[PDB]
Design an enzyme around this catalytic site. Structure first.
Site, PDB file in Angstrom:
ATOM      1  N   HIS A 159       1.449   3.773   2.193  1.00  0.00           N
ATOM      2  CA  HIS A 159       2.055   4.386   3.363  1.00  0.00           C
ATOM      3  C   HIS A 159       3.569   4.159   3.398  1.00  0.00           C
ATOM      4  O   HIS A 159       4.112   3.244   2.763  1.00  0.00           O
ATOM      5  CB  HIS A 159       1.414   3.876   4.624  1.00  0.00           C
ATOM      6  CG  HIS A 159      -0.016   4.308   4.811  1.00  0.00           C
ATOM      7  ND1 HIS A 159      -0.903   3.551   5.550  1.00  0.00           N
ATOM      8  CD2 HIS A 159      -0.639   5.433   4.429  1.00  0.00           C
ATOM      9  CE1 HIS A 159      -2.034   4.224   5.610  1.00  0.00           C
ATOM     10  NE2 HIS A 159      -1.930   5.357   4.941  1.00  0.00           N
ATOM     11  N   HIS A 201      -7.387  -1.692   5.805  1.00  0.00           N
ATOM     12  CA  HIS A 201      -6.501  -0.700   6.420  1.00  0.00           C
ATOM     13  C   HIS A 201      -6.333   0.529   5.527  1.00  0.00           C
ATOM     14  O   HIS A 201      -6.202   1.655   6.019  1.00  0.00           O
ATOM     15  CB  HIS A 201      -5.132  -1.361   6.669  1.00  0.00           C
ATOM     16  CG  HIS A 201      -4.044  -0.383   6.978  1.00  0.00           C
ATOM     17  ND1 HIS A 201      -3.905   0.216   8.217  1.00  0.00           N
ATOM     18  CD2 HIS A 201      -3.059   0.095   6.172  1.00  0.00           C
ATOM     19  CE1 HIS A 201      -2.861   1.036   8.119  1.00  0.00           C
ATOM     20  NE2 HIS A 201      -2.299   0.988   6.908  1.00  0.00           N
ATOM     21  N   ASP A 213       5.685   2.986   5.535  1.00  0.00           N
ATOM     22  CA  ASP A 213       6.249   1.711   5.965  1.00  0.00           C
ATOM     23  C   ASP A 213       6.271   0.677   4.820  1.00  0.00           C
ATOM     24  O   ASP A 213       6.834  -0.429   4.999  1.00  0.00           O
ATOM     25  CB  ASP A 213       5.542   1.168   7.197  1.00  0.00           C
ATOM     26  CG  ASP A 213       4.031   0.981   7.106  1.00  0.00           C
ATOM     27  OD1 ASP A 213       3.385   1.671   6.287  1.00  0.00           O
ATOM     28  OD2 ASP A 213       3.490   0.196   7.949  1.00  0.00           O
ATOM     29  N   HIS A 230       0.864  -1.178   0.000  1.00  0.00           N
ATOM     30  CA  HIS A 230       0.000   0.000   0.000  1.00  0.00           C
ATOM     31  C   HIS A 230       0.896   1.222   0.000  1.00  0.00           C
ATOM     32  O   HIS A 230       2.143   1.109  -0.004  1.00  0.00           O
ATOM     33  CB  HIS A 230      -1.112   0.004   1.054  1.00  0.00           C
ATOM     34  CG  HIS A 230      -0.667   0.117   2.472  1.00  0.00           C
ATOM     35  ND1 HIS A 230      -0.190  -0.963   3.163  1.00  0.00           N
ATOM     36  CD2 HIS A 230      -0.713   1.165   3.333  1.00  0.00           C
ATOM     37  CE1 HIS A 230       0.074  -0.542   4.401  1.00  0.00           C
ATOM     38  NE2 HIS A 230      -0.224   0.735   4.559  1.00  0.00           N
ATOM     39  N   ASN A 254      -3.121   2.834  13.020  1.00  0.00           N
ATOM     40  CA  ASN A 254      -3.460   4.011  12.267  1.00  0.00           C
ATOM     41  C   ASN A 254      -4.599   3.714  11.298  1.00  0.00           C
ATOM     42  O   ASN A 254      -4.356   3.067  10.271  1.00  0.00           O
ATOM     43  CB  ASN A 254      -2.219   4.545  11.524  1.00  0.00           C
ATOM     44  CG  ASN A 254      -2.572   5.660  10.568  1.00  0.00           C
ATOM     45  OD1 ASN A 254      -3.422   6.511  10.888  1.00  0.00           O
ATOM     46  ND2 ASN A 254      -1.964   5.669   9.366  1.00  0.00           N
TER      47      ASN A 254
HETATM   48  N1  LIG Z   1       0.921   1.692   7.620  1.00  0.00           N
HETATM   49  S1  LIG Z   1       0.733   3.018   8.526  1.00  0.00           S
HETATM   50  O1  LIG Z   1       1.185   4.182   7.833  1.00  0.00           O
HETATM   51  O2  LIG Z   1      -0.663   3.052   8.945  1.00  0.00           O
HETATM   52  C1  LIG Z   1       1.707   2.871   9.997  1.00  0.00           C
HETATM   53  C2  LIG Z   1       2.955   3.536  10.150  1.00  0.00           C
HETATM   54  C3  LIG Z   1       3.730   4.242   9.058  1.00  0.00           C
HETATM   55  C4  LIG Z   1       3.813   5.761   9.193  1.00  0.00           C
HETATM   56  C5  LIG Z   1       2.396   6.399   9.373  1.00  0.00           C
HETATM   57  C6  LIG Z   1       2.380   7.955   9.294  1.00  0.00           C
HETATM   58  N2  LIG Z   1       3.072   8.385   7.984  1.00  0.00           N
HETATM   59  C7  LIG Z   1       4.511   7.859   7.912  1.00  0.00           C
HETATM   60  C8  LIG Z   1       4.529   6.318   7.967  1.00  0.00           C
HETATM   61  C9  LIG Z   1       3.570   3.494  11.408  1.00  0.00           C
HETATM   62  C10 LIG Z   1       2.985   2.836  12.492  1.00  0.00           C
HETATM   63  C11 LIG Z   1       1.785   2.127  12.350  1.00  0.00           C
HETATM   64  C12 LIG Z   1       1.233   1.379  13.466  1.00  0.00           C
HETATM   65  C13 LIG Z   1       0.541   2.038  14.478  1.00  0.00           C
HETATM   66  C14 LIG Z   1       0.001   1.307  15.545  1.00  0.00           C
HETATM   67  C15 LIG Z   1       0.139  -0.069  15.611  1.00  0.00           C
HETATM   68  C16 LIG Z   1      -0.485  -0.857  16.719  1.00  0.00           C
HETATM   69  C17 LIG Z   1      -1.454  -1.952  16.166  1.00  0.00           C
HETATM   70  C18 LIG Z   1      -2.048  -2.787  17.318  1.00  0.00           C
HETATM   71  N3  LIG Z   1      -0.919  -3.441  18.117  1.00  0.00           N
HETATM   72  C19 LIG Z   1       0.065  -2.391  18.693  1.00  0.00           C
HETATM   73  C20 LIG Z   1       0.646  -1.527  17.552  1.00  0.00           C
HETATM   74  C21 LIG Z   1       0.832  -0.736  14.572  1.00  0.00           C
HETATM   75  C22 LIG Z   1       1.368   0.005  13.520  1.00  0.00           C
HETATM   76  C23 LIG Z   1       1.177   2.134  11.101  1.00  0.00           C
HETATM   77  C24 LIG Z   1       0.051   1.198  10.894  1.00  0.00           C
HETATM   78  N4  LIG Z   1       0.082   0.174  10.066  1.00  0.00           N
HETATM   79  N5  LIG Z   1      -1.069  -0.482  10.268  1.00  0.00           N
HETATM   80  N6  LIG Z   1      -1.784   0.149  11.190  1.00  0.00           N
HETATM   81  N7  LIG Z   1      -1.119   1.212  11.614  1.00  0.00           N
HETATM   82 ZN   LIG Z   2      -0.575   1.718   6.299  1.00  0.00          ZN
HETATM   83 ZN   LIG Z   3       1.528  -0.314   8.668  1.00  0.00          ZN
END
Ligand SMILES: NS(=O)(=O)c1c(CC2CCNCC2)ccc(-c2ccc(C3CCNCC3)cc2)c1-c1nnn[nH]1
Ligand SMILES: [Zn+2]
Ligand SMILES: [Zn+2]
Ligand SMILES: [Mg+2]
Length: 231
Positions: A86, A149, A88, A84, A180
């Site tokens: 984002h 997501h 990461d 996707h 997120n």
């Molecule tokens: N893919 S993302 O961008 O949404 C993401 C990122 C990347 C950054 C986002 C802002 N823009 C720059 C990149 C980083 C972290 C997280 C995340 C957040 C919370 C969790 C918790 C989940 C429950 N269990 C505990 C952990 C895990 C992943 C996330 C993420 N990926 N899946 N959901 N959130």
């Molecule tokens: Zn994401």
């Molecule tokens: Zn993620």
């Protein structure tokens, strides 16, 4: 019990974990809202080459990922797919492309990455625009389950090993929160999970975008996490 955890990987370092013959996950750490999270991708042996699924969340980690692959596996990474838009998943695409890796994503992902100001994979993957669509790409199948997501999220199946890489559409079993969800579709997410369950009933390993791999239970668990968040 040996999968590396967040507190075990300094930011900037990458670990590899052997999932099955010719299948590894890659694990890195980085910062979101001032907190450090682990993040997974996949590596799949493609003859005498490697297919990479997702960056290691940023330029420094992605360079460390290539170095770890050089040391541990010793086969060249020739192609990468981002699941996707984002960071990461695409953050570090420029590092890949300067290492000669051909980078791919669906047009949906490319459009969203462009609008976000993130790095954009070079090549566009047609054939994934409708929920339930699938394409074979080297040693994997790419599957678009529908919005979850994110609206563009893909999952990846390795048929030789019955490994399902869910990316950020799938949460680990310990999850008690949905992460997120700013770009998520909380209503469609359970329907998209059901499509994955129906399409990959033989999956033996399920790898989340963040956290520990497990079995098929990560799929229903994810739907449950998302429902608890929605309400
Ligand atoms: N893919 S993302 O961008 O949404 C993401 C990122 C990347 C950054 C986002 C802002 N823009 C720059 C990149 C980083 C972290 C997280 C995340 C957040 C919370 C969790 C918790 C989940 C429950 N269990 C505990 C952990 C895990 C992943 C996330 C993420 N990926 N899946 N959901 N959130
Ligand atoms: Zn994401
Ligand atoms: Zn993620
Ligand atoms: Mg960027």
């Amino acid at each position: 019990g040996e999968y590396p955890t967040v507190n075990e990987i300094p930011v900037g370092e990458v670990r590899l974990y052997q999932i099955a013959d010719g299948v590894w996950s890659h694990i890195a750490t980085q910062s979101f809202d001032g907190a450090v999270y682990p993040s997974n991708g996949l590596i799949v042996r493609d003859g005498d080459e490697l297919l990479l699924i997702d960056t290691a969340w940023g330029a420094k980690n992605t360079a460390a990922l290539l170095a770890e692959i050089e040391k541990q596996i010793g086969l060249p990474v020739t192609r990468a797919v981002s699941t996707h838009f984002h960071d990461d998943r695409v953050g570090g695409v420029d590092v890949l492309r300067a290492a000669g890796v051909a980078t791919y994503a669906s047009p949906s992902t490319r459009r969203l990455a462009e609008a976000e100001g993130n790095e954009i994979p070079t090549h566009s993957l047609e054939g994934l625009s409708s929920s339930g669509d699938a394409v074979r790409f080297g040693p994997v199948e790419l599957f678009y389950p529908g919005a979850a997501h994110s609206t563009d999220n893909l999952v990846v199946y390795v048929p030789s090993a019955n490994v399902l890489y869910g990316g950020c559409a799938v949460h680990e079993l310990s999850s008690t929160s949905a992460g997120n969800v700013a770009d998520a579709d909380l209503a469609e997410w359970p329907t998209s999970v059901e499509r994955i369950q129906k399409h990959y009933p033989e999956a033996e390993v399920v790898i989340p975008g963040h956290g520990l791999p497990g079995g098929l239970d990560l799929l229903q668990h994810t739907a449950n996490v998302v429902k608890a968040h929605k309400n």
